[PDB]
Amino acid sequence: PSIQLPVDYNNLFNEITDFLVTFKQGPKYMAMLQKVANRELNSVIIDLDDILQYQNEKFLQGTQADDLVSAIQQNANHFTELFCRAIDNNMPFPPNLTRRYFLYFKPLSQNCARRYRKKAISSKPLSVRQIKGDFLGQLITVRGIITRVSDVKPAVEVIAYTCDQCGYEVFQSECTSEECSQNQTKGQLFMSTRASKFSAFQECKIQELSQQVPVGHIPRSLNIHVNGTLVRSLSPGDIVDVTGIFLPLLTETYLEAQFVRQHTSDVEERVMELITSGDVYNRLAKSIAPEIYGNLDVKKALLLLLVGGVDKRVGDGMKIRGDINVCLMGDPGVAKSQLLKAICKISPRGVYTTGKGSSGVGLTAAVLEGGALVLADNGICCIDEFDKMDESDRTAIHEVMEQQTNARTSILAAANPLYGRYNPRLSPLDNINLPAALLSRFDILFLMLDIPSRDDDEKLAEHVTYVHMHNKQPDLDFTPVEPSKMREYIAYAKTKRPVMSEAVNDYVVQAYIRLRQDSKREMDSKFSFGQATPRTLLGIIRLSQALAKLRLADMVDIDDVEEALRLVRVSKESLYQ
């Protein structure tokens, strides 16, 4: 049954031809078609902002105008052919069966719509969950992350046949050409694959991000189809804004992609304020979780671990890691896991984990879906109850602790004593499940002993009870640095690269030799965590690099080495309480 709508394609097509002829860069699109006419380009990109600009230009000139962009917005399926029809007759067997070029539309920009006092609803970065059935056949922009891309597959648009009886080229078993239809004898058809119209096609899927998900729901996905020269513009894991035609008594839906895109003095002034305040080395350490008791020397290790060391690809493929590994042993109930939460929260690439790997797939990868260690690549992994991990769980840990594969991570481990409560009279290896093979890979191995002492517990109890009473630590005289600024300075520090001088070079070997020779007595006494090995020499080097890079220093100084030596010696003091 016939009906009437206000849409008039006659005005729009004339406007399209006029827009092609008139809209300048001479004309922008005529120059583009000239390049295609010169056989230099294979695809044509139509800019809706250019169309909207012309509409406003016509609107400001007072001439006739129709909302061509909205017409293309509502019915992009047919307007794609109309632009091809305009180009097929204006560019400097039925034509559609032989066309080898491709055409796409790029979306309106929100700045342009606001500048022309209009609303660009289609180009709004909506999620796939918000795309109702009203958007079928409408060019819309979708914001999300690609989760799966298929390989290139043939996509025949028109199938070509040749006939023996007439020699005509038949396009789509028996020849339907005029000669064979008249003749009593018809030549049987065969597939002329070299003459069939192949189109490059790939299958892509987009999915909502976590922040786009409602309460407790699963992020939904939508099908994105890519054709023509646009192929291989999407790869898995890409957070992209894709504009395409959302296309379909129940109807399944998919989208044909048309446009693809991916997703300092301002902070230096805050850095200047930090430099103005001074005490950068200790202020950052003091700012690390003020609600936690005063483990300043331990939290200093967190500051250097958060900053990290400096990687050194020596050559010939040989590698030296730039990460820092610190362990946090201690009795249960001291709430030490809160620091693990704090550090993971502070780090922008931190991954948190408790005990054994989640369902086993928490480590390594599954049929691949990477685990926690792979997730924290170029980041930090915090583990609570490290000793309870399975052999397979710890086996994957050792490889990452040794090879960083990628699983480039800084490892912060927390573990309760193997007996439930610690025994200082025993060696640390006896009181823990972990052997010396894994502990030797650590840089700093601080131990917490929940020693009942009226003096210390009085301060800690007052410290904690004030944290519950007031939303800030009782040390109100100190103003902590906000995590964003703490993160920014660490990122600012990360850009620097301190280098050793010859003066510190001799100092490092002198301190190493001095400490190594005396550490023989420490191991002979059997009352120390570990013997002095090149773990101490290289450990200080990484720590000195971190301290120098923490100070934003271009070169390493002696005081960093002494401070690094100080912290290492401080860590042994816990065993003697």
Partner: protein, 585 residues
Amino acid sequence: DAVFGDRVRRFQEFLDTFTSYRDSVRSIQVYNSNNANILPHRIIISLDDLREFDRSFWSGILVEPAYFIPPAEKALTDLADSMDDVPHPNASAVSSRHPWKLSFKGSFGAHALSPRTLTAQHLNKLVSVEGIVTKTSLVRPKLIRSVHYAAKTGRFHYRDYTDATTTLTTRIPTPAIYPTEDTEGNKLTTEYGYSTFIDHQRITVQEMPEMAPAGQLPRSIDVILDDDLVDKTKPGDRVNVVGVFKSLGAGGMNQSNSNTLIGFKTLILGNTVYPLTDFDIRNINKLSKKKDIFDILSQSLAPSIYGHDHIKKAILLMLMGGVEKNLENGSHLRGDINILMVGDPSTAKSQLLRFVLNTASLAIATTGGLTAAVTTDRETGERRLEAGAMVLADRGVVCIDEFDKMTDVDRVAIHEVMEQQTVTIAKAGIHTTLNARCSVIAAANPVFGQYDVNRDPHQNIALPDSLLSRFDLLFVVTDDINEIRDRSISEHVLRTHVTIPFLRKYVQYAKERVIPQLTQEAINVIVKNYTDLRNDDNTKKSPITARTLETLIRLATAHAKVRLSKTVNKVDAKVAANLLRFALL
């Protein structure tokens, strides 16, 4: 037919004889004009009002929906399409063409059923069914009206469609796809921007276990939802749904197909979804001012248990809970309290847990999918996560029986639940964090059945110390026999051979309004008692750690909620210190 038009006018009369219906439609029309989100084109019809206006028409909806509802749908659509001129330049061509749907309320008469009570006698009737949403199907748009342009003739065209589900009456099916050529035979220009589509979803409703008799499989029924109802529910929700119970297909009537096992498929065309004082408040606050209200409330709790005053007090404190805090560094402080019970299996543990589970408003029973990190698939293959008791009990309480029987996978997951009040889900392709702010009460038994009172549960039950340290309060009960005393409690058993409804308001109001903060009075008490406990090297139920200090603050805050004081006092810390000593001895 002419009968169809008669009932359309009859419904129009009903929409006019009670202007309270169509004036709300005008309110919808006014609101939609201002937003040039969109309010749904749906109104709820009171069946009692329809009963008193036209008994036959009111009975028509209940008894003969196919011949009465579509006339009513057209009349409501006609009223909405004529009450305004729709001056929108372009929206008048697409948005104004959506018909208006009906909803129903009031007395359902005999049509108030369950999936079990729903039978073949109820087919072709509008009925209300009560049940639970087991699962939901995937949402897809469904074509309703097609709009196309005949370019050769220079004028647009359109075509409608019918479905066995959307058409209550048996109209001729239209399996034709969106047309390419019309009567003129010219190739049509497709108009997607002006065609009409409506979303559709399928859900499964099962009889509630509360009325299910043993020895039979559960009864379920499918409900069809469209447009506004397409995504209004999630699996596991209690629901009352009103819809047309209608059959489809044929039970082998075509050709021979004379097998005796084949039956007719049935489902419900749902159209209305119902997902499922100051005098007391002033009495709640007034009762708080007497000194013994803490003990009196501690005696109304568990009337079937004699003694166990500290346990009953502990239950009250756990319900009251503490106060959570936030820090400028971005950290958060736990406030809730957990309780653990240990000892001989049948001795009063299942009895105490039964009362708390029945009394608490958001109590969930658990025993050894609680981790909420597993998915369930639909009939078409797509899958969705299912919630877990720890996650569902957010701002509630978890009741655990046979806690000793739970697996190690549960223990590692509950470690973050009891300490960080969150669940960090890390699975293949699924990663999310869910709040688990739930109070925990659990019961456990020794392996031998008889508890060795000389030793801690770490050897009588052998649970990990890290897991056990997460419980703020622990109690051990065993039926040590005093014959004259056991006679007193057994007489009531042999007899078988403050009011709770107001108390639940007392618990609700106190936690709803009172958020106590700490005071200098308790600061000295907390530090001194904690230091004394650290100084006490004698054997105890558990060693003294910072969590004991946290428990004292949580317990003192809970007592302040009992007193309904927004600031703590020295008496609250005194009670908590004494109670913790009892739990540590």
